[PDB]
C-alpha cells in the first residue's frame, strides 16, 4: 500500500553498491525513518534477487531494541524500497575509528546489547554470521543496532557449510571446512569485544593464510592494558571448540558485563 510519494526525502545517509539509504519522513504520521532504495535491474543483473529476498524475510520478522527494525517495504517500476529504523548516531565502525578504541563501560554496554539481540535471533534459529563493527549502528542514546543480515540464515535443523563473514572474524570451524552452527556468532562476539577494547582484531596479519593460522591456533595475545574481567570474557568466547564457548546468556551474566554495562532500554509504545 505504500509508495515513494508517502515520504518526504530529507538527505542521503549512506551510498553503497546497490544501494542508497535516505533520511525520510512518512507524511501522515510525520515519522522519521530511513529508506533503503535498491534498483531492480542492477540486482537482477548481479543475480542477487534470492539473496535480497532472504535478507528481507529475516530482518522483517525480527523485533528487538538492538536489531534495526524493518517496518515495511514496497516497490515501483524500477526500485525496491525498504522502510527501516533510523539510527541517529550512525555507524558504529566510524565511532570506533574516531576514538581508536572504546573504554570498558562502552564495550560492556555494547556487549550486553549484542548478546541480547543475538539471543533473540538464536531463539528463532537465525544465525547472523557477520557480526563486526561495520554491521552495527547506534540509536538515539548510543544503543547498538544490528543493521545488516547479509550473511544471515534461518537454520532450523541442518547444520551449515557456507564459508561466510569477514576474514578477521571467521571462526576456526569455517576455516577448517567443518559444518557450523549458531555458535559461530559466539566466536564473532569475542572478536568484536576484543576489537572494541583494542581497536584491532585479535588475529590481524599481512596475509589471509597467516590470519587463518592465527585463528585455528587461537593465537590470542592480549595487550597489557586490558582488565582481567575483559580478558576473561574474551577468552571464554574465543574457544576453539564451539560447544565450549560461553553462551549468550553467559555473556549477559558475565561479571565484567554486569559491573560495567550502562545499558538503557529504549521506551516502548503504550
Amino acid at each position: 500500500k505504500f509508495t515513494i510519494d508517502d515520504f518526504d526525502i530529507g538527505r542521503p545517509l549512506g551510498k553503497g553498491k546497490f544501494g542508497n539509504v535516505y533520511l525520510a519522513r512518512e507524511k501522515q504520521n510525520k515519522f522519521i525513518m530511513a529508506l533503503k532504495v535498491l534498483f531492480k535491474s542492477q540486482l537482477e543483473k548481479e543475480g542477487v534477487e534470492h539473496q535480497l529476498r532472504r535478507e528481507i524475510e529475516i530482518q522483517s520478522h525480527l523485533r528487538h531494541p538492538n536489531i534495526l527494525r524493518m517496518y515495511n517495504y514496497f516497490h515501483d517500476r524500477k526500485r525496491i524500497y525498504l522502510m527501516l529504523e533510523f539510527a541517529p548516531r550512525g555507524e558504529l565502525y566510524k565511532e570506533l575509528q574516531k576514538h581508536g578504541r572504546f573504554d570498558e563501560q562502552r564495550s560492556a554496554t555494547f556487549m550486553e546489547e549484542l548478546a541480547d539481540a543475538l539471543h533473540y535471533c538464536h531463539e528463532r534459529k537465525v544465525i547472523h554470521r557477520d557480526i563486526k563493527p561495520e554491521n552495527l549502528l547506534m540509536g538515539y542514546k548510543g544503543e547498538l543496532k544490528i543493521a545488516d543480515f547479509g550473511w544471515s540464515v534461518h537454520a532450523p535443523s541442518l547444520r551449515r557449510r557456507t564459508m561466510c563473514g569477514t576474514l578477521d572474524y571467521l571462526p576456526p570451524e569455517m576455516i577448517e571446512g567443518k559444518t557450523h552452527d549458531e555458535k559461530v556468532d559466539l566466536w564473532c562476539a569475542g572478536v568484536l569485544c576484543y576489537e572494541f577494547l583494542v581497536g584491532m582484531p585479535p588475529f590481524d596479519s599481512p596475509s589471509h593464510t597467516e590470519t587463518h593460522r592465527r585463528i585455528v591456533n587461537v593465537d590470542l595475545k592480549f595487550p597489557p592494558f586490558l582488565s582481567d574481567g575483559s580478558k576473561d570474557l574474551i577468552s571464554k568466547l574465543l574457544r576453539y571448540h564451539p560447544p565450549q564457548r560461553l553462551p549468550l546468556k553467559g555473556v549477559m551474566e558475565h561479571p565484567w558485563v554486569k559491573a560495567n554495562s550502562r545499558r538503557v532500554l529504549p521506551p516502548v509504545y503504550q
Binding site: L43, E49, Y73, D76, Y269
Partner: protein, 43 residues
Amino acid sequence: IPAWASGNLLTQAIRQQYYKPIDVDRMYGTIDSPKLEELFNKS
C-alpha cells in the same frame, strides 16, 4: 535539504520520537506489503 532534516528541527524530532514512540506494529505492520515473489515483478 528541507528544514525538518537538519540541525535542530531534526534532533528535536528524533528526541520526540524516542520518548513518545508510536505503535509501529499497528501503523506499519498491519499494512499490506508486496509478496517477496512479486518484488522483481510488475508493480
